[PDB]
């Protein structure tokens, strides 16, 4: 039983905490609770191999961008989250991808692009163009709702694979 050090990154309000809490606690709650820096641990079996998840849920407000260099150097996998109803959240993915690729100094770096809030009717972001960004990063793209439990085990569990098969 090894343990993977996953880091959930992206713009404020995209649902990084909701994803972690859907995973970790298996329920949802709409609320106002912006994150500074939360950490969670959860032991789980993926593929039949029992492992332990070490999940850092981050603050994506600009004035916390000094924090990242740290969380990036120590992190093994990066879950890059945007909101399928927010195109700004989507363009902010570029900041992250490009710092991750300096601090680690690799174009290969375990990572999964996440299109959260997919339960909502107001898509401003089409799978197609997310599909493509991901394909151009050479990484998997997974749509999710933390609201519905949809794509969530998938999204964390894929990023684990990304690290193992890395």
């Amino acid at each position: 039983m090894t343990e993977y050090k996953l880091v959930v990154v992206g713009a404020g309000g995209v649902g990084k905490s909701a994803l972690t809490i859907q995973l970790i606690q298996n329920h949802f709650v709409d609320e106002y609770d912006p994150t500074i820096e939360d950490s969670y641990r959860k032991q789980v079996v993926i593929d039949g191999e029992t492992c332990l998840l070490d999940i850092l849920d981050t603050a994506g407000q600009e004035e916390y961008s000094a924090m990242r260099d740290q969380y990036m150097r120590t992190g093994e996998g990066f879950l890059c989250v945007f909101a399928i109803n927010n195109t700004k959240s989507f363009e902010d993915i570029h900041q992250y991808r490009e710092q991750i690729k300096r601090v680690k100094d690799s174009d290969d770096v375990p990572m999964v692009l996440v299109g959260n809030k997919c339960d909502l009717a107001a898509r401003t972001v089409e799978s197609r163009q997310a599909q493509d960004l991901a394909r151009s990063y050479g990484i998997p793209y997974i749509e999710t709702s933390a609201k519905t439990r949809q794509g969530v085990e998938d999204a964390f569990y894929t990023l684990v694979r990304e690290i193992r098969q890395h």
Binding site: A11, G12, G13, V14, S17, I21, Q25, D30, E31, Y32, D33, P34, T35, I36, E37, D38, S39, Y40, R41, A59, G60, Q61, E62, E63, Y64, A66, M67, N86, K88, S89, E91, D92
Partner: protein, 320 residues
């Protein structure tokens, strides 16, 4: 290089239009010019003593657009950026008065506040850690609440504008009067300033590992109190701070309502105006397509394009 200040008069006049039609549009196109733009607008607006107009209105339109309320100002916008810049420019002394004492304390401490059973060392006594944390906090929060009146009038008026905006929008929702303020003064000011003291130049030393971690625990505590959230249903291991949260909620509410209650509003600019024009020229094409849409801005955005073209012409004639 740039033209005399007189050359931009018609331009300036349009920018300063109350409806802020130009600024709204620019908020759409800037993209990666976002800081630079913010920087220029503020200098211009401050020069006109119209910052309030800029920030109240631009914050107001962002509240208008929101629809969903637990996402408000949670992302990056031009509005968020303006606020960040305006707050650095005018609220540093406030941050020093309220925070410096306790930040210095935390740096030069050497006892751990670690609560998470997983991070605890051999022999490390979580009972003491919690006591150290709760004390640091107790002091800090005292100093914060007692700087309620050191915050400059104009910023407070802007916070006032925020309260009135979410009023109109969500009259029946009785949480947003304080949350909207919490998001700027804690999430986007104080909590960062604790996390990264260099922010407002409180101290320029990298924290010890423990100080580093203390500032984080602290800011987590303060952001939870700021939000009015008791620990337990999220991270498990922070239960021991809820008494601090429970005994300070009413003071946090007072502090957040009071802070906005001010309803009385309390050199050459060709460099700045030139540079703003440069940005308009640059996003010339994206600006056309916004003036292809109807509504009451269209009028103004077309006058814009005129002047943008016209000014670029005048600058060519200046060119050698």
């Amino acid at each position: 290089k740039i033209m005399p200040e007189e050359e931009y008069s018609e331009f300036k006049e349009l920018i300063l239009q109350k409806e802020l039609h130009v600024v709204y549009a620019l908020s759409h196109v800037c993209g990666q010019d976002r800081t630079l733009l913010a920087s220029i607008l503020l200098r211009i607006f401050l020069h006109e003593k119209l910052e309030s107009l800029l920030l109240c209105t631009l914050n107001d339109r962002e509240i208008s657009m929101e629809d969903e309320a637990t996402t408000l100002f949670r992302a990056t916008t031009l509005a968020s950026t303006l606020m960040e810049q305006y707050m650095k420019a005018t609220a540093t002394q406030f941050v020093h008065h309220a925070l410096k004492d306790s930040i210095l304390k935390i740096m030069e401490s050497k006892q751990s506040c670690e609560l998470s059973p997983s991070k605890l060392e051999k022999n490390e006594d979580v009972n003491t850690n919690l006591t150290h944390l709760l004390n640091i906090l107790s002091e800090l929060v005292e100093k914060i609440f007692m700087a309620s009146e050191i915050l400059p009038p104009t910023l407070r008026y802007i916070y006032g504008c925020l309260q009135k905006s979410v009023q109109h929008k969500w009259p029946t929702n009785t949480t947003m009067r304080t949350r909207v303020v919490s998001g700027f003064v804690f999430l986007r000011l104080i909590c960062p300033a604790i996390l990264n003291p260099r922010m407002f130049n409180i101290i320029s030393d990298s924290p010890s590992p423990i100080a580093a971690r203390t500032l984080i625990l602290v800011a987590k505590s303060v952001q939870n109190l700021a939000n009015l959230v008791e620990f337990g249903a999220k991270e498990p291991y922070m239960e021991g701070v809820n008494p601090f949260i429970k005994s300070n909620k009413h003071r946090m509410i007072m502090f957040l309502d009071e802070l906005g209650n001010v309803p009385e509003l309390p050199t050459d600019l060709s460099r700045d105006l030139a540079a703003l024009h440069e940005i308009c020229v640059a996003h010339s094409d994206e600006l056309r397509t916004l003036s292809n849409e109807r509504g009451a801005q269209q009028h103004v955005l077309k006058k814009l394009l005129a002047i943008t073209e016209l000014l670029q012409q005048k600058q060519n004639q200046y060119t050698k």
